[model samples]
Target chain A: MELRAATKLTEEKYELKEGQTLDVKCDYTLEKFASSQKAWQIIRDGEMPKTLACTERPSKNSHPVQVGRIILEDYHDHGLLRVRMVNLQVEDSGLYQCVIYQPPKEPHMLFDRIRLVVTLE
Target chain B: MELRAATKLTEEKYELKEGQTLDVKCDYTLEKFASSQKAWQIIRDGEMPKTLACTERPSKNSHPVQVGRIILEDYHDHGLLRVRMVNLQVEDSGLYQCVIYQPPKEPHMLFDRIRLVVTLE
Candidate 1:
C-alpha cells in the first residue's frame, strides 16, 4: 500500500526536538512482495511537508538526528536499501516516516510515514 | 542454512586482524522460506566467535564496532531481528557476522554466519 509512494507527508509535519527520545518501527508484509530489491526508511521530525518532506525532492532527508534506533520485529529479511536522516534542526519534533520501497520492473516506491514528536523536559 | 545455528566457529578459529575494511552480503531463497518471523545477523571481525558470537549464549552481542553499515541487496526486505555488534576493540580487524533467523511453528531458528576480518595499517 504505497501510502506516500507518490504523495506528500500530509501537512502535519514531522518534528523531534534535540535530546528527545523516540522509538520507530516498520512491519513487513506477512507474505512476499512482488520483488525483493525493495527497501525502507524510518524518518525523524521536520518542517512543513513542502519545505521539509523527503519527497518532491527525494534528496531531502532528515538532518543529523541525535538518536535513531531500530528493532526488526516484523520486516528486515530481504535487505535495507538506504537508511538515512533527512531535513533537520536542534528542535526538530514529531513523528518520522518509515518508508518501504518496492523496487524492480516498475521501480515503484512505497512509503509509510510515522509521526515522531520529540521534546525535552 | 543454519550454518552456525547449532554449531560453533571452526576450531581453526574465527579472527579479524582488526581495523581493516570489510564488507559482507546474504542472499535469500528468491522463492520462499518456511516462516516469516525469522531473522539474521551480519557480524564484524573479532578476537573469537566464542565471545563475540551472538548465538549460543544468545545473550552477548557486539561490543559496538566503530562502523556497522548495510545495503539490502538481496535478503533484507522483511525485518531485522537483532542487529547487534559483537566483541570489539580499538584495532579489531576482520568481517562482521550478519545473522538471519527463521522462526516458525517448527520453532526452528535458521542462520548463515558471515566472516569479517578487519585490520589496520
Candidate 2:
C-alpha cells in the first residue's frame, strides 16, 4: 500500500485574542492521477464539518474566493493553500482542516488540522 | 442542585507563528469549600496529561513558578490563572487545560482548554 502524508501541523492548537486576524497555511504534495479538489473545512462540537472553501480543478486560473469573513487563496502550482480570517470573534473558533476531496472511492484526504482559540483580551 | 461552569474558552483553538510568546489566561469562580489546587496541564498526542504547575493552597504567598520553558502565575484570590510559554516552536503545540484539582472525590475541575498551534512563518 502506498503511504500518504497525514495532515501537517494538525497537532498544534492555535490561540488568539478577539478581533485579531487569523492566517493559516496548508501544504500538500499532489498525486499525479488524483483529482485536484482542495478545501478548507471547519469542525465544531455537535455540528457537522463545514467546508469554508474548495478549489476547482483549474485552481491555477482561479481567483481568490471569499466565504463570509474568510479569504481563501490557492497556490496549487506551489503546493500551498492559505486561509485568512479577518476580525475574528469568539464564535469563529473551531478545528480547521485542510483537505483534498477524492470522489467515489475516498471522500477526502486530510492535509492539515488546525485548532483555533479566540479569547477576550 | 448546583451546576458549575465547564471550562471557559475551551471551544476556541489558538494559532501562532514560531518563536512567538504564548500567553493564556484561565478564569474560574471559586467554590467556598473547594481546594485551591489550581493547575496548568498539557495533553500531547499520546502522552498522559502532565502538570506544568499547580498552586499550593497558600498560593497567595506563592511566587511565579517555572517548569521547563513555561511560567505559571496563579491569582487564586482573584480567581484567575495565567501561563506564559516563551519562544514557542512547532513541537510545543498541544492541548493546554486550566484546571483545579479537588482530590479524593474529584481529581480536577476544568476551567478552560486552550489549543495552541505554532507554525513557521
Candidate 3:
C-alpha cells in the first residue's frame, strides 16, 4: 500500500504571538481500517531527533516531551493531522515534518513544512 | 501566470462532532508581494455561490457572514494561504472551493475542494 501525505504550510511561515497557540496542519490519505502509524518529528541544528508518533504519545518523563509547552494534535483515518506548539518559547523554532509508517510499502509521502518564527511580544 | 493550490482533506472526510469548532484548512502559494485576490466559496445543492475574497471580509449583516457562526480565516504570501471555517452548524455542509482572483492573463489555478459531512453526534 502506497500512502502519500499531502501537506500545506498554510503559510510559508507562521509568525506566532508570544501567548497565542501555534497550529500547523498536514493532510494525508489512509484506507478505511488501514492501520498506518503516523507521527511528527522536528530537527533543529544537529542532534538526533525522535518521532512523535501518533500511535505513541510520549509520557511527561520522555525527553523532547515538553509535557505541555509543545503538543502534536492530529485527526486520523481521513488524512488530517495537526501540530500545535502551544504557548511558544523562542527556542521552539525548527523544521517540522510529518511521517507515516505504512505497511511494508515505500509510500511516497508529500507534506509542506514550515520554518516557525515564534516571537516575543 | 498559473496558481496551483495544494490541498489535503487530512482525512478523506472529516466527521466533525457537534459543539466542536470546525477547522478545515487549505494552503496555497503566492508571489512575494504578488497582488492576487484569494477567497473561499461554498456551493450547496443549488443557488449561485459567492466568492469569499481574501481581500474581502464580509460584514456581519452579510448573508454568508453569520456574525460568528461561519468564518473563513487565511494566511498568505510566499506560496501559502489557509482557510479556517470556525464553529459548527448542521447547515454548513457543502463543497468548499478556494478561489483566486489573479491578475489578468488567465491563470491556471489548482486547489482541493471538500464535501464537508458534519454530524450531530
Candidate 4:
C-alpha cells in the first residue's frame, strides 16, 4: 500500500513575539458521541518544557451535551482539522495525544497518539 | 438548568523552547465525516503569528478516508481536544480555529471560530 505522507507545512516559520516564552498547538480529528467523556487531555505535562498557556476552562463546553450530532465534516478528508494552544509555559512540555472514546462509559478510551520535542527561542 | 462550567485547565503554562522563536497549538473536537472534500483549511493565514509547524500536508489524512464511521465518542462533552503546533515563527502567530465540515464540497465551511492576540514571551 502506498502510505503517502500527505501532510504539508505550507509555510516558512511562525512570527514570534518578543520576550522568551513558548506556545504549543495540536491539530486533531475525532469520533462523535453524546457523552462528555470521549475527550482528550493536554497531559498537564508534555514531552517537552511546560507551557503557561491553556484554556482557563480546559474542559469547557461550546455547546450542550444533548443529541450528539455526528457531523460528517469532523472527518472530512481529515483535512486541516487543527487545534491551537497558545502562551505556553516551558515546563508545560511532553508527549501529547488525540484520544477518542467508546460509548456507554464516561472514561472510555477510544483513540490516542503522541508528539514530542517542541522547539525554543 | 445547572449549566455548570465543566471545563478546567487543571494545569497552565507550557514550558517553551528558546532560540528567539515562537510556537502554537490548537485543541478541537468534531464529528466524523468521510468521503472528505468535507475538509478544512487553516486559512493559510491566521489571527497572530504565521506558524511553520503544520505538516507539509495540512490536509494529511491520518487514517484512510474510509467507511466514514461517525464514531459515537467524538461528541463526548468534549473533554480536552487539544492539538499542538511547535517551533512557531513570529509570523506563525495568529487567530486559530478548530473548524468542522460537512461531507462533499472540498471547500465547505462547516463551523468556524477565531482566537486572536497570541501574546509574546
Docking class of 4: incorrect
Judge candidate 2 at residue B74 and give its lDDT: 72
Which 10-residue window of candidate 1 chain A scores lowest in summed lDDT?
A: A1-10
Candidate 3: residue A5 Cα off by (Å)? 20
lDDT of each: 0.29, 0.58, 0.45, 0.26
Error of 1 at B38 (Å): 43
Off by over 4 Å in 4: A1-37, A43-82, A104-109, B1-121
The whole-model C-alpha lDDT of candidate 1 against the native structure comes to 0.29
**RMSD of each predicted structure:** 20.8, 18.0, 18.5, 22.6
Model 3: residue B61 alpha-carbon error in angstroms: 68
The alpha-carbon lDDT assigned to residue A20 of candidate 4 equals 31
Q: What is the TM-score of chain A alone in each candidate?
A: 0.36, 0.75, 0.63, 0.33
lDDT of 2 at A93: 75
The estimated TM-scores of all candidates read: 0.24, 0.42, 0.37, 0.22
Tens digits of per-residue lDDT for model 4 on B11-55? 112233332322222223333322112221232211111221222
Clashes of 1: 74
